[PDB]
Task: inverse folding
């Protein structure tokens, strides 16, 4: 579970798969008013 | 919200789009105030 | 460098309550786990409980679960072992033990301490 | 195996109405 | 003494040639030439 | 004596005893490190406990552990086991227990030592070709060990199951398309084959939906008999430029290896997985923090 602040601004999300798991990226928590996406979670999913 | 998986097929009445084994699911919740990520087996319920 | 010392042992009426102490010294890093064992004479060792230090979470063996309670003083880094409602089968020498790592105590108390590296002198207890 | 919570106890799911033609609007936001 | 002046551009070209001569030396120290690293200390640390 | 002096190396080049007025530049003086700086994760240890309890799966359902932002002690883990084989690529067996990484991946399974030759990518066999394959890029290590009697909580399985055919039946029902395994990935056939192969030579098949390209997925599991003590295999992979934190060994936490004290003088540094020599300064923040 990840808490999200409530607002109305443009946001970016992203997801990739590596041998390390499933990586989740978002614009929030680092670059909120830009759009750059930084990883915020790695999920233990190892089947492709 | 997303469903992600490694194997896909059809439901009972032939409709496409059933994920079989462990399935990754990303659901927002809380009127868009949290993001909930889980990874498990969705068994379709009966009923109308 | 690491020294473990048990104390507080004595004889109490069966169904009583008692508390040991295990002074611990020689740790330069806070990431370790400390376990309690007992040895009944003429048999093999078997573990009772353990505390994982940085996390603080504790676990106990099946036999003495609930009956015993383990804790640690925040300033003395010494672990305890509270027995309540003792029984005649609880006559043995209580051992203290530790390890370099932090994740071995769970396997250790369920494999009579195969993974430990540090041992205490022990403390005999006999219940009347 | 985590405990995700209490299994739902309702008998029937809500009726879902698929109307693709109502959602076929075109607002382009290409990558820049 | 602007960019339209063609002899001034030659002066700048000569200065730039000096700079490029130095920069190739500086930049070829980060080349690995097929090794596991371009740092000798890293190689010494990682291998036998 | 060539290395005695500046004039000596003047003479040894030019190959002569009467070097002309050859006004060299000669070898330079480099500074000596007056200290050492180390930063890393504090109070957190990589947790190998799941490896200790429960039944270890087969080679084709190997379980994977991923460690980031922790301190590790691989020697402690390898002490609890009777190490049969221990071979590393692009890293040395002594180094894998002492270097700093950004991510460590430990894949463990139940493997009988008899097919040790089937674990290298060379000598393909059925294991490296259908079951488990390590990446050729990152440094790797491979471990074969036996659990001792004194370690009780690893529940021994019932037999050594492993895939021998994982192949795809095209719609023509004539062509057989082998399904090679890709590095650090599960075989495509793990969805049908059960955890333990009931009988040596059994067959499994499933029909693929048109979304998956139709056809059939056909697999077969072979079995090798148990041993007196369980034999397991470990695969270790390490990555370098992936996290802002690192996986480092544990040190002794009573040292003076602080940046703020040795500010302005040449020092060794091991800030995280990255290390070198340099001079630090207080300075205005300029990147992404
Ligand atoms: C990273 O992990 C390694 C691997 O475990 C670890 O090194 C080990 O340290 C232990 C420390 O106890 C060593 O254990 C010793 O083993 C001898 C037998 O060879 C025992 O006799 C010793 O027990 C006596 O001594 C203790 C005090 O030293 C007493 O308290 C005890 O009751 C006994 O009287 C002792 O346990 C072990 O041999 C090494 N193993 C190796 C391979 O070096 C290392 O310390 C870890 N690193 C960090 C930073 O934690």
Result:
């Amino acid at each position: 579970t990840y808490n999200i602040t409530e607002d109305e601004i443009l946001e970016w999300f992203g997801i990739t798969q590596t041998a390390q798991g499933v990586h989740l990226f978002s614009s929030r928590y680092v670059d909120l008013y830009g759009g750059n996406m930084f990883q915020f979670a790695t999920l233990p999913v190892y089947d492709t | 919200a997303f469903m992600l998986g490694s194997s896909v097929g059809n439901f009972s009445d032939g409709k496409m789009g059933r994920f079989f084994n462990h399935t990754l699911v990303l659901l927002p919740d809380g009127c868009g105030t949290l993001l909930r990520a889980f990874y498990c087996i969705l068994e379709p319920r009966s009923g109308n | 460098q690491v020294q473990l010392q048990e104390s507080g042992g004595g004889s109490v009426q069966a169904g009583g309550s008692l508390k040991l102490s295990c002074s611990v010294s020689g740790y330069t890093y806070s990431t370790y786990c400390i376990a309690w064992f007992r040895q009944v004479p003429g048999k093999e060792r078997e573990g009772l409980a353990f505390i994982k230090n940085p996390e603080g979470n504790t676990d106990y063996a099946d036999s003495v679960q609930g009956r015993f309670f383990i804790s640690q003083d925040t300033v003395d880094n010494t672990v305890y072992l509270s027995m309540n409602s003792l029984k005649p089968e609880d006559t043995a020498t209580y051992y203290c033990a530790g390890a370099v790592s932090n994740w071995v105590c769970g396997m250790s108390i369920k494999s009579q301490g195969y993974g430990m590296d540090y041992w205490g002198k022990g403390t005999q207890v006999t219940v009347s | 195996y985590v405990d995700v919570g209490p299994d739902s106890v309702k008998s029937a799911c809500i009726e879902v109405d698929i109307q693709q033609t109502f959602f076929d609007k075109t607002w382009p936001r290409p990558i820049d | 003494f602007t960019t339209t002046n063609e002899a001034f551009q030659k002066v700048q070209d000569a200065v730039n040639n000096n700079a490029q001569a130095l920069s190739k030396l500086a930049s070829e120290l980060s080349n690995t030439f097929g090794a596991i690293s371009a740092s000798i200390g890293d190689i010494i640390q990682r291998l036998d | 004596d060539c290395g005695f002096n500046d004039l000596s190396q003047l003479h040894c080049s030019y190959e002569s005893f009467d070097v002309e007025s050859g006004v060299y530049s000669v070898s330079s003086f480099e500074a000596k490190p007056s200290g050492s700086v180390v930063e890393q994760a504090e109070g957190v240890e990589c947790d190998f406990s799941p490896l200790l309890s429960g039944t270890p799966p087969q080679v084709y359902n190997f379980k994977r552990l991923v460690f980031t932002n922790c301190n590790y002690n691989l020697t402690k883990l390898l002490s609890l086991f009777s190490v049969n084989d221990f071979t590393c690529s692009q890293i040395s067996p002594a180094a894998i227990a002492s270097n700093c990484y950004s991510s460590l991946i430990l894949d463990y399974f139940s493997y009988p030592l008899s097919m040790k030759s089937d674990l290298s990518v060379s000598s393909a066999g059925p294991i490296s070709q259908f079951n488990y394959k390590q990446s050729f890029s990152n440094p790797t290590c491979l471990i074969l060990a036996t659990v001792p009697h004194n370690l009780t909580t690893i529940t021994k399985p019932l037999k050594y199951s492993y895939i021998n055919k994982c192949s795809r039946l095209l719609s023509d029902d004539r062509t057989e398309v082998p399904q090679l395994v890709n590095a650090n990935q599960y075989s495509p056939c793990v969805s049908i084959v059960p955890s333990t192969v009931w009988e040596d030579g059994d067959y499994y098949r499933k029909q693929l939906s048109p979304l998956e390209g139709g056809g059939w997925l056909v697999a077969s599991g072979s079995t090798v008999a148990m041993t007196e003590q369980l034999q397991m295999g470990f695969g270790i992979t390490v990555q370098y430029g992936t996290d802002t934190n690192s996986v480092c060994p544990k040190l002794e936490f009573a040292n003076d290896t602080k940046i703020a004290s040795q500010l302005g003088n040449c020092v060794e540094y091991s800030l995280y997985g990255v290390s070198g020599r340099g001079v630090f300064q207080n300075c205005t923040a300029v990147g992404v923090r």
In short: Chains E and A do not touch (no CB pair under 8 Å). The longest helix of chain E spans residues 6-27. The helical segments of chain E are 6-27, 40-46.
